[PDB]
Design an enzyme around this catalytic site. Structure first.
Site, PDB file in Angstrom:
ATOM      1  N   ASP A 280      29.865  12.892  24.132  1.00 14.59           N
ATOM      2  CA  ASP A 280      29.089  12.033  25.080  1.00 14.59           C
ATOM      3  C   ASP A 280      29.985  11.626  26.250  1.00 14.59           C
ATOM      4  OD1 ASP A 280      27.009  12.149  23.276  1.00 14.59           O
ATOM      5  OD2 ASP A 280      26.835   9.961  23.043  1.00 14.59           O
TER       6      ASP A 280
ATOM      7  N   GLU B 245      17.751   8.924  22.745  1.00 18.39           N
ATOM      8  CA  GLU B 245      19.145   8.453  22.953  1.00 18.39           C
ATOM      9  C   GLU B 245      19.469   8.447  24.449  1.00 18.39           C
ATOM     10  OE1 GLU B 245      21.380  11.536  20.155  1.00 18.39           O
ATOM     11  OE2 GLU B 245      21.704   9.392  19.613  1.00 18.39           O
TER      12      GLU B 245
END
Ligand SMILES: [Mg+2]
Ligand SMILES: [Mg+2]
Length: 477
Positions: free
Chosen positions: A71, A333
């Site tokens: 990420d 998300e």
């Protein structure tokens, strides 16, 4: 046609304080498969080409040989402008150790926030193939992140995604996590997830970038059990990935989107006709009880909204969620609010494997458009929500990134954590490509956002592929 009419949506703005939640319905979600074609072996892609991420080479470089990177988010402002500092580009990534004994798929509970930098404005002929990122190392001091959990029983802690806001000139919003797991990796006690803020100072000269501060962590938000699902309601709940932004329609305020779960007891048969979203006479509708019997009640994603209760931005109040996917998908998300053409795009990432029974879609980015931060959000591209997926045959099983099914596209799990940048550039990391696991940045790609639809730009870079980890600054701080 066996595919239903999609639930219509207005794009109508509500008050951000209003209890209105836009629904990403089964009838919406089922448009993805509907819009798709049965792939033509040798073809292993069912998706419309316009909604497909191009194929990433299996010879991809690491971002760093010594770090797993997934990420990632840039240095930015509350306007989502991407910021350079003294001619340097800066990113932040979840990091872990490839040789610490744990496999890639158990990296999550070992995640630390690192940063990388490089010179802005370097042309491709002078940028190395790996993007030339210099590893800065761990952003926070050892033990600073885990302080928030006082003395509770725990068997690991990690730092999970959020965002960096230049404003101590830098505020790092992220998720502090604590876990208490047995042998089998079952939760002794429910994991703890707390959206936190750490402040520090970026500093640079002609030769490097470095930070100070980030010593005192401020806990901001954990689930309430009323809008956002606690660990007690659901040991497998999600609460993470804050994206902090200013809505020009609402100055004096600062907002935050984040990933949550609908606040019910796990196993409740609490899905309604609203979550299905069929017309009564649609021949292709589904029976509510039939849907809940399939186990779709375990898929209850939401995107939450919070607002600063002060100028300091050190205190935040929960608002009602702005999007649910009840009985559709358990994960929405890294949500973001992308402002374009006086419109509000909600982009969020999801996994094929977190879809409810009877619904299906690829790993990648989902998008919704409205007139406000709280809208009857219009799902992009045929009222489906899919913006950009990994090439996938939805007519064949998913497999897993650790166990690729050869009846399925070997790049079905090629990228994840799609983050949309100014001008519609998209950055992401490489998960699985055939036998190889990534933990490295994907080629940057470019989508052309055109009202209710999006197109992957294949004139961009190498037939749609830009530089590995091309996450560029727009603006000097
Ligand atoms: Mg150390
Ligand atoms: Mg499935």
């Amino acid at each position: 046609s066996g595919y239903p009419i999609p639930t219509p949506h207005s794009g109508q703005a509500y008050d951000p304080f209003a209890d209105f939640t836009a629904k990403w319905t089964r009838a919406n979600a089922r448009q993805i498969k509907a819009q798709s074609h049965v792939p033509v072996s040798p073809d292993q892609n069912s998706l419309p080409l316009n909604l497909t991420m191009p194929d990433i080479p299996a010879d991809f470089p690491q971002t760093n040989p010594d770090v797993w990177v997934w990420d990632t988010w840039p240095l930015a402002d509350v306007h989502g402008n991407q910021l350079s500092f003294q001619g340097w580009e800066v990113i932040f990534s979840l990091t872990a150790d490839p040789h610490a004994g744990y496999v890639f798929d158990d990296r999550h509970v070992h995640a630390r926030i690192g940063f990388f930098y490089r010179k802005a404005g370097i042309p491709a002929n002078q940028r190395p193939i790996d993007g030339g990122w210099i590893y800065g190392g761990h952003l926070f001091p050892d033990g600073s992140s885990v302080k928030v959990f006082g003395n509770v029983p725990m068997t690991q802690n990690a730092e999970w995604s959020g965002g960096a806001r230049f404003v101590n000139n830098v505020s790092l919003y992220y998720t502090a996590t604590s876990f208490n797991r047995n042998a089998q990796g079952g939760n002794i006690t429910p994991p703890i997830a707390i959206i936190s803020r750490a402040d520090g100072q970026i500093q640079a000269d002609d030769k490097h970038v470095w930070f100070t501060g980030f010593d005192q962590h401020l806990p901001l938000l954990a689930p309430d059990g009323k809008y956002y699902q606690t660990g007690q309601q659901n040991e497998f709940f999600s609460f993470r990935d804050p994206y902090v932004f200013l809505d020009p329609a609402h100055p004096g305020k600062t907002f935050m989107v984040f990933e949550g779960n609908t606040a019910v007891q796990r196993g409740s048969r609490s899905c309604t006709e609203a979550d299905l979203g069929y017309s009564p006479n649609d021949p292709n509708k589904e029976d509510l009880n039939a849907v809940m019997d399939s186990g779709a009640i375990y898929q209850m994603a939401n995107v939450g909204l919070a607002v600063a209760t002060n100028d300091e931005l050190t205190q935040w109040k929960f608002l009602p969620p702005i999007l649910s996917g009840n009985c559709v998908n358990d994960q929405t998300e890294r949500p973001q609010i992308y402002l374009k053409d006086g419109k509000y795009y909600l982009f969020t990432i999801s996994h094929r494997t977190t879809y409810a029974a009877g619904v299906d879609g690829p790993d990648g980015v989902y998008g919704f458009v409205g007139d406000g931060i709280r809208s009857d959000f219009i799902p992009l591209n045929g009222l489906s929500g899919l913006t950009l997926g990994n090439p996938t045959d939805l007519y064949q099983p998913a497999g897993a990134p650790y166990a690729l099914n050869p009846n399925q596209n070997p790049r079905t799990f090629q990228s994840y954590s799609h983050y949309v940048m100014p001008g519609g550039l998209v950055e992401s990391f490489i998960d699985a490509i055939g036998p190889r696991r990534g933990g490295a940045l994907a080629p940057t790609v470019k989508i052309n956002i055109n009202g209710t639809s999006t197109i992957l730009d294949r004139t961009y870079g190498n037939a749609g592929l830009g530089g590995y980890g091309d996450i560029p600054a727009n603006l000097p701080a």
